[PDB]
Amino acid sequence: SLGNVLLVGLGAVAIQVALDLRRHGAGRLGALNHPGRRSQRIAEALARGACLQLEGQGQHRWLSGNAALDVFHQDPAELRDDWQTLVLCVPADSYLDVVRGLPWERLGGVRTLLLVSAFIGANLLVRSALPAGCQATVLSLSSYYAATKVIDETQPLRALTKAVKRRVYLGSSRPDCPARETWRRVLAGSGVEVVPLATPEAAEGRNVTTYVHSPFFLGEFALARILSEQGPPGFMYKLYPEGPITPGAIGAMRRLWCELSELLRRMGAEPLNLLRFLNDDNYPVHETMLPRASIDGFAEAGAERQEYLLFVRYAALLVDPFSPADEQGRHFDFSAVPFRRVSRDEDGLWRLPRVPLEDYRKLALIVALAAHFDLAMPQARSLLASYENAVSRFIDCQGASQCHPSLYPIDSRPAADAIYRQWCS
Amino acid sequence: SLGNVLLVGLGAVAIQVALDLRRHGAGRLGALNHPGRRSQRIAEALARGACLQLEGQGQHRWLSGNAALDVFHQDPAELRDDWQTLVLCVPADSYLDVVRGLPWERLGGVRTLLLVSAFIGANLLVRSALPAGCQATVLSLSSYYAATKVIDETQPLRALTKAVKRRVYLGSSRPDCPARETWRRVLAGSGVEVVPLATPEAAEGRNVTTYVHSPFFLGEFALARILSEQGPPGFMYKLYPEGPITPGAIGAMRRLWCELSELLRRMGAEPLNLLRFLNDDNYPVHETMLPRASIDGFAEAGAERQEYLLFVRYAALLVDPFSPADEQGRHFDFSAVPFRRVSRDEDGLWRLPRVPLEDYRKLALIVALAAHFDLAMPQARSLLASYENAVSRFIDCQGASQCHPSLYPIDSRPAADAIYRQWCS
Ligand SMILES: NC(=O)c1ccc[n+]([C@@H]2O[C@H](COP(=O)([O-])OP(=O)(O)OC[C@H]3O[C@@H](n4cnc5c(N)ncnc54)[C@H](OP(=O)(O)O)[C@@H]3O)[C@@H](O)[C@H]2O)c1
Ligand SMILES: NC(=O)c1ccc[n+]([C@@H]2O[C@H](COP(=O)([O-])OP(=O)(O)OC[C@H]3O[C@@H](n4cnc5c(N)ncnc54)[C@H](OP(=O)(O)O)[C@@H]3O)[C@@H](O)[C@H]2O)c1
Numbered sequence: 001s002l003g004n005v006l007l008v009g010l011g012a013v014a015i016q017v018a019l020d021l022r023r024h025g026a027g028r029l030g031a032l033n034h035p036g037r038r039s040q041r042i043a044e045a046l047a048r049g050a051c052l053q054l055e056g057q058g059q060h061r062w063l064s065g066n067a068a069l070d071v072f073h074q075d076p077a078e079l080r081d082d083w084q085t086l087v088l089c090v091p092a093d094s095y096l097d098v099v100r101g102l103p104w105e106r107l108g109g110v111r112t113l114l115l116v117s118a119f120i121g122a123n124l125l126v127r128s129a130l131p132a133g134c135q136a137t138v139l140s141l142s143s144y145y146a147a148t149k150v151i152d153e154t155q156p157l158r159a160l161t162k163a164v165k166r167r168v169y170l171g172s173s174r175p176d177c178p179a180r181e182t183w184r185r186v187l188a189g190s191g192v193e194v195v196p197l198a199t200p201e202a203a204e205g206r207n208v209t210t211y212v213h214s215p216f217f218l219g220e221f222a223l224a225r226i227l228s229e230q231g232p233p234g235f236m237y238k239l240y241p242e243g244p245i246t247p248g249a250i251g252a253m254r255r256l257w258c259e260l261s262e263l264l265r266r267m268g269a270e271p272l273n274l275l276r277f278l279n280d281d282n283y284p285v286h287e288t289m290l291p292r293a294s295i296d297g298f299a300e301a302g303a304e305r306q307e308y309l310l311f312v313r314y315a316a317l318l319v320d321p322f323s324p325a326d327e328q329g330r331h332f333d334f335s336a337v338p339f340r341r342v343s344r345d346e347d348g349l350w351r352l353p354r355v356p357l358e359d360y361r362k363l364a365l366i367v368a369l370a371a372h373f374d375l376a377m378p379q380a381r382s383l384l385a386s387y388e389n390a391v392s393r394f395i396d397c398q399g400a401s402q403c404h405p406s407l408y409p410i411d412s413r414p415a416a417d418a419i420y421r422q423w424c425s
Numbered sequence: 426s427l428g429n430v431l432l433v434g435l436g437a438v439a440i441q442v443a444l445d446l447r448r449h450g451a452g453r454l455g456a457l458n459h460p461g462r463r464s465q466r467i468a469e470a471l472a473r474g475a476c477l478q479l480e481g482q483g484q485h486r487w488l489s490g491n492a493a494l495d496v497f498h499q500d501p502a503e504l505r506d507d508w509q510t511l512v513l514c515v516p517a518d519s520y521l522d523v524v525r526g527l528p529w530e531r532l533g534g535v536r537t538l539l540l541v542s543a544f545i546g547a548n549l550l551v552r553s554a555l556p557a558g559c560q561a562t563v564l565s566l567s568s569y570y571a572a573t574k575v576i577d578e579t580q581p582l583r584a585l586t587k588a589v590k591r592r593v594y595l596g597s598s599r600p601d602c603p604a605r606e607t608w609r610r611v612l613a614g615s616g617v618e619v620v621p622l623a624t625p626e627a628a629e630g631r632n633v634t635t636y637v638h639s640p641f642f643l644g645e646f647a648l649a650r651i652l653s654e655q656g657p658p659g660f661m662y663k664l665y666p667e668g669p670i671t672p673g674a675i676g677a678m679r680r681l682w683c684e685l686s687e688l689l690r691r692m693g694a695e696p697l698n699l700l701r702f703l704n705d706d707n708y709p710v711h712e713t714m715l716p717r718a719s720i721d722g723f724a725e726a727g728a729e730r731q732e733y734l735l736f737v738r739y740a741a742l743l744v745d746p747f748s749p750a751d752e753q754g755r756h757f758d759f760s761a762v763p764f765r766r767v768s769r770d771e772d773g774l775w776r777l778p779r780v781p782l783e784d785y786r787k788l789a790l791i792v793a794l795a796a797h798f799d800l801a802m803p804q805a806r807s808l809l810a811s812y813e814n815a816v817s818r819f820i821d822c823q824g825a826s827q828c829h830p831s832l833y834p835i836d837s838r839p840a841a842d843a844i845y846r847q848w849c850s
């Protein structure tokens with residue numbers, strides 16, 4: 001079945017998954033999280049008798065439950081060969097470090113490894129990093145299937161899920177993989193439809209953040225908010241000047257979707273209809289704003305129409321059109337997610353929030369991979385250089401000695417080269 | 426050059442105009458307001474010593490002043506022939522009525538008649554009703570040049586100008602007409618730029634409400650709010666579902682602009698660039714939402730681009746992007762102007778607000794006029810039909826005995842025919 005399940009990285013995602021895993025019945029449930037303040041707080045909470053707790057918000061409160069953890073490790077040396085399934089709940093830009101850091105000499109019994117938020121090439125990269133003869137199947141879930149946050153870092157085991165996707169996709173490094181069906185069931189428990197696809201890259205090409213975060217949060221407006229310490233953070237999904245969404249950002253979104261689509265075709269995977277994907281799998285609007293015919297025909301509609309429809313879609317979501325109206329006729333301000341900004345870590349060094357550091361690193365790797373398929377991806381590269389220039393000016397102003405080295409530019413070509421070699425086996 | 430000036434319709438517009446007239450320099454100032462409760466209060470206020478009182482709000486505090494009314498009539502037949510200039514400050518739907526009611530055969534001293542909110546064809550309609558040989562020049566202003574309101578019907582001659590337009594247009598029935606220059610200076614005193622055009626219809630075709638109110642407030646969503654009794658009233662300039670703006674309504678806007686522009690051309694008037702007119706004459710947005718080259722090139726853009734640009738324009742104006750940002754990074758909610766709705770009058774009868782009643786009437790005339798130039802105007806007719814069917818069902822439900830006669834069907838063909846006859850003269 002799933003056997004004993006080890007969660008790697010015990011954050012908001014891991015707690016949602018733990019709930020769904022305990023509904024399905026796992027056998028033993030463990031977690032490994034690298035040493036640090038969070039791990040320390042987790043161990044204290046578990047030692048005081050706490051359990052993982054998940055709160056569903058609003059119409060999701062039916063999801064609420066508690067789940068028990070059998071073992072927690074903040075030290076890989078105590079791991080023994082007790083685990084059949086590994087679930088990576090760490091940031092996706094850390095998958096390589098995490099897979100290299102795992103004690104595989106002690107994990108020979110692992111037969112499945114699930115990437116909960118994969119990107120194009122993640123399955124191949126993880127496999128290139130496995131030890132020789134490893135025969136764990138690697139599974140790529142397209143995106144994390146919910147929106148979950150740890151409310152209060154002082155209660156590190158309590159998370160709140162505010163939203164749930166209608167549907168996600170799941171590929172496997174092993175053809176016709178039986179494990180996909182198990183995960184379909186596991187996630188069905190929280191209301192999500194899991195669509196199995198014949199290839200990990202087909203699933204990885206349906207990672208929603210690659211298509212949305214890249215054009216919106218790697219641009220000038222977003223980085224200016226993110227790299228700022230004074231003034232209001234702005235809003236991530238509002239129109240200029242309150243947020244980053246402009247016709248030019250929408251054009252970037254269209255042009256990058258075309259590039260990513262061509263890469264997926266060159267790796268043997270069917271691209272997606274971006275508008276139907278956003279509307280049908282993530283969050284819809286009314287037929288008056290987006291006609292069903294326009295959604296289904298998006299890929300054939302021509303660039304100007306395509307960009308008009310994407311803009312309408314994001315404008316139509318500035319509020320939640322299905323939320324209840326207030327006394328005055330207003331709907332919930334769905335678009336007001338403030339931007340998280342740079343902050344100083346415990347060593348005094350400036351650090352970047354995961355938006356956009358994670359989005360930058362995923363795209364840099366996808367671009368470097370695409371060069372092996374002779375694909376230049378100029379729109380992706382333009383968004384990379386926009387991020388690089390903004391961060392470089394922030395180091396200039398702030399001083400290098402003040403900045404965590406994750407702010408410096410990272411070389412994606414070794415990883416791309418390992419991905420491509422793995423692909424050509 | 427203005428001589429003695431008779432203001433016809435002593436309401437908010439007239440008070441503002443009176444003060445602008447006095448700043449420039451005029452003769453005696455008279456007013457003609459037809460009988461009614463308002464004229465009764467005016468008469469008492471005048472008997473108690475009242476003046477015309479203008480107050481400018483905030484920025485415009487410098488507009489404030491008082492002006493004496495030298496004469497007040499309610500009965501057109503009591504007018505003496507001591508008037509060189511007439512200014513029609515009544516609703517435009519009453520221009521024909523007013524001109525037909527005046528004893529022109531003993532008003533041979535009138536040299537100028539100014540229509541303050543002239544619709545397409547208004548100049549020609551007014552001239553239609555003048556006696557042969559009448560030598561008065563008819564001037565057409567594209568629209569009233571401020572936003573003005575009598576605060577309290579208790580102090581009937583005290584008005585509040587809360588804002589002043591950027592620019593209006595003025596055309597004259599007399600080619601290269603002198604009095605045009607005089608009125609340009611008079612209104613410039615308020616801060617508006619007045620642009621003389623070569624014919625009356627060139628100016629009449631630059632009324633913004635014809636192009637915006639028609640598609641937005643004659644549609645199904647706006648009428649459902651306007652005819653609504655209970656529930657929140659909604660917002661005139663927000664997107665569906667909080668307001669009437671949808672891709673479909675923007676399509677209506679583009680198509681109606683096409684139809685109006687062809688009518689103007691057949692009438693000898695150069696039409697306008699809708700996008701340029703909205704941005705430069707009404708409220709601008711930043712270059713990143715609407716590039717100047719896109720604004721200037723709008724007429725030549727192609728229908729899909731044009732519709733996208735129009736939608737961007739209204740979406741960009743959901744908040745005032747030039748308003749100061751608050752602590753949270755939000756701008757002023759410029760789009761939350763609630764719909765005014767039907768209400769019972771003095772006699773208990775349901776009345777429609779000026780929006781959309783005056784807009785329906787203006788558009789009905791334009792469509793009837795256009796038929797004489799062999800122009801079907803199907804978009805305009807679809808909007809008229811939507812209004813008529815909605816208002817017709819409201820009468821069905823409430824009962825005609827409960828509805829004011831202004832809600833009943835109208836036939837604008839007799840006025841259309843006279844405009845056309847005068848135009849062919
Ligand atoms: N949360 C969401 O709703 C959401 C939405 C979309 C996508 N995602 C995806 O899911 C990922 C996880 O989100 P999350 O919210 O669960 O994150 P999170 O709460 O920050 O948790 C990640 C966990 O992994 C550990 N971790 C972080 N960085 C690591 C590294 N370099 N090496 C090893 N362990 C590390 C963390 O511990 P420390 O804090 O101690 O490092 C923490 O326990 C996101 O990064 C993204 O890829 C999540
Ligand atoms: N005020 C603005 O800011 C503004 C802005 C844009 C457009 N406009 C346009 O300009 C027009 C005038 O506006 P307003 O605000 O001044 O309206 P108002 O306050 O209604 O004033 C109209 C005045 O004319 C009188 N009147 C109406 N019909 C008449 C007739 N046939 N003969 C003589 N007097 C008559 C009214 O008397 P009763 O009340 O007794 O009928 C009233 O005193 C409006 O229709 C409006 O669409 C005004």
Ligand SMILES: N[C@@H](CCN[C@@H](Cc1cnc[nH]1)C(=O)O)C(=O)O
Nearest residue numbers: 208209212237278282283317334335
């Ligand atoms: N949040 C997602 C990215 C997709 N966001 C949604 C829009 C949205 C979310 N909240 C307010 N608007 C979208 O673009 O369709 C993720 O990170 O996976």
